[PDB]
Amino acid sequence: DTYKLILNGXVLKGETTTEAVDAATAEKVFKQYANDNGVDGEWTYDDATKTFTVTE
């Protein structure tokens, strides 16, 4: 499936997508991308939209 990532860094925002077989795998990809790019914070998932948010 296509999963989405919302990255909220206070006044700064971003977003991205990945293809993955399930949600746990997409989150591993999203958590590495977020961390590689300086974005650390609280994670939540909307399984109705297959969208993760990381909030600084």
Numbering used by the authors: 1 to 56
List passages from the publication reporting this PDB structure.
Thus, we chose to engineer the loop L1 of the 56-residue immunoglobulin-binding domain B1 of the streptococcal protein G (GB1).35–38 The solvent exposed loop L1 in wild type GB1 is a type-I β-turn with lysine at the i + 1 position and threonine at the i + 2 position that lacks a COi+1 → COi+2 n → π* interaction.
Encouraged by this result, we next incorporated serine with moderate helix propensity, valine and threonine with low helix propensity at the i + 2 site of the type-II′ β-turn. Thus, to obtain a quantitative estimate of the n → π* interaction energy (En→π*) at the i + 2 residue in 2, 3, and 4, we resorted to NBO analysis, which clearly indicated a decreasing En→π* in the order 2 > 3 > 4. An overlay of the type-II′ β-turns of both the β-branched amino acids valine and threonine revealed a clear difference in the side-chain rotamer conformation. Valine in 4 crystallized in a gauche− (g−) side-chain rotameric conformation, whereas threonine in 5 crystallized in a gauche+ (g+) conformation. 5 with the strongest COi+1 → COi+2 n → π* interaction displayed the maximum stability (TM) and 4 with no detectable COi+1 → COi+2 n → π* interaction showed the least stability. We were surprised to note a very good correlation between the TM of these proteins and En→π* between COi+1 → COi+2, in the absence of the stabilizing COi⋯HNi+3 hydrogen bond.
